[PDB]
Amino acid sequence: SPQPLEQIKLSESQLSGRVGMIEMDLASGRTLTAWRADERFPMMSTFKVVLCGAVLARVDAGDEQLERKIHYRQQDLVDYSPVSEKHLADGMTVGELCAAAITMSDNSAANLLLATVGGPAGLTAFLRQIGDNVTRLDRWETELNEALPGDARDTTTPASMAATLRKLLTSQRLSARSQRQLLQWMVDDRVAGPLIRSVLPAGWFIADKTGAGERGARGIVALLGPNNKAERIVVIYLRDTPASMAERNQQIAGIGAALIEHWQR
Template sequence: PVTKEHLKEGGMTLGGLCAAAIEQSDNTAANLLLDAIGGPAGLTNLARNLGDNATRLDRKEPELNSAIPGDERDTTTPGAICSDMQRLLLGDALSEASRRQLEDWLQHNETGEQMIRAGVPNNWIIGDKTGRGSNGATNDIAIMRPPDRAPILLAIYSVGSTATANDREEAIAEAAKIVAETFVSAAQNAAKNTSDYETASHLFDYDAKAPLDIHDTIIEEFDGGTLHDITYTSPKGGPVAAYLVVPKGKGPFAAILFSHWGNGTRAEFVPEAKLYARAGAVSLLPDYPWDRPDPWHKTPNHYDKPELDHEIEIQAVLDVRRGIDLLLARPDVDPERLAYVGHSYGAQWGSILSAVDKRMKTAVLMTGVAETGDIFLRSNDPGIVGLRKSRPPGQFEQYAQVMGDIDAIHFVGHAAPISLLFQFANFEQYFDKTSMEHYAAAATDPKKVLYYDTGHDLNDPQALEDRYGWLAKHIDLGQVPILPGSSPKIRAP
């Protein structure tokens, strides 16, 4: 309907074609756009570059609308399309200006009034794109912006129905209504959770004026600085053992607080901390209560007595938080350049600290889990499955409930203005990608989410390089070679 009107004008801009194809479903405009990007194969290649291995386009309009049962040509999945929308509308696949323009076209769509738009509250801002084809194919995809919450991406596909066109559209509207009501209910629960968060956050109060009672011994000198074996007093009593890595020079230095994974020790990040010492950062690497000798040792995993684990994990967070006091008490540390890096359990601690302690400028959360239940109730890891089967019925449900008030998901939404870098593993064995996406989506901006082809230990060298790049940007580290073959770029901190 649009391109026909412009025939006498001699043509249309690509922007005009995009508007016509999206806002009015102009098939000729869509075909001209396909020609501009290399045809159907070009669009399929774009999908692959977005990480979408499901979507494929084989033909142009109108042939692509045949929707023949069993024919894989010109097909996708709702999940794939939602992932594509996330990368295009909310991710970094497009520039900010291009993201705004694409969403503006979607918001001005004139073909979707009876579908998703009809099913959601009137005060939601909707941008959508509809599709209709043979064999009852009726589709709508949308970015929905409710007031005072993160955007929602929705894709609804229907094919094979013999109902009338109006009935098919009403079915999509009804599905959208169910989704909207779910999120409205979730928002109401979130209001309650805010109250719960305020209560839970006080679990991590402590006496910041208590003496640290630091004992410090240099145990190694290396080319970038010194490695210290230190202890300081836990807010819950007893010594916290930690490594302290100090650069050469007088500073002022950036500071990094490291928290290892549950099966690790304070030694996990020593090589990385030495690297950052060469880049101009003091690093503190404390242990957890279950890593300490008697009488201060506290064994975790009391599945039959979750309140004990609850207290142990609170102490772990407090001990790490006390490490912030230790770092900022040092005269060689710049208090405006403090970062946090946490792996697994350490990521959970970082989510909590980012909410309750605003002295950090940024935090890196490595292979963290959103909720205790994502592992103990929903993990498909053989070891976890076997453990679950070995316990009495209902025990893990009770465990997850008791531990739930200190789950990362309840705190990461209060991190702002602290920036967050999420690093997840594509081959994560303990929890699924839904947990990862739930975790990242709940976090406040500014944030960045990265995935790596590795497991929970996150031993991909690229993850280290990305972590260094993030920290260098946010706490002004010096430039040092990270990976083998990296060109040495060293400047004075």
């Protein structure tokens, strides 16, 4: 495999779109690999990890309970509601909604959660409260995936997203139990977790959230490491590429291979 930076460059060339990537040590925050790390990319569904961080912050403050049942109606549902469409009559708890949003990519669950945290503006305010002055959410599902060229709405940068994920998971801004819950939701991702495990060598940890959007936009935020430990945050975003989903997936996997084969940096 090429060196990781070389592989990222090769991927960007093969995809004919922009790639953004960071590799960061979870414990220390050091940046090991960076490529277009200060450029903007649509978050797509990856925003949901930050969303549930904001929910957990409210729980810690005594302003929310993961047990609280949210009642909703059919008119509230948007595209891709695999869990939430089943619970019109019995509702879902706030915690169940975070599980659906992060582990099943349920868009309506994400919108219900957004309403509990003050909407996109509330989520952006939370980002500023934790020192992320770059990432921004402006719209609800599904419009936040529009990925218009040059539009800063609903974007992050690889560097900001990595730092924010590290803050949420490890910095003691969230309580010990809340940090553990956020991590566990990422561990339990059903959309990409098992697929990734099927191609990871034995002994490698993965936790993740993936997203896809318009104009080829694709991303992953992940925790990865050897010896069954979450050693590094890896954030990869793709935008403005015409490539098939399979090819985007394969290029992201190829960056992963390069990282694994050149891990000691």
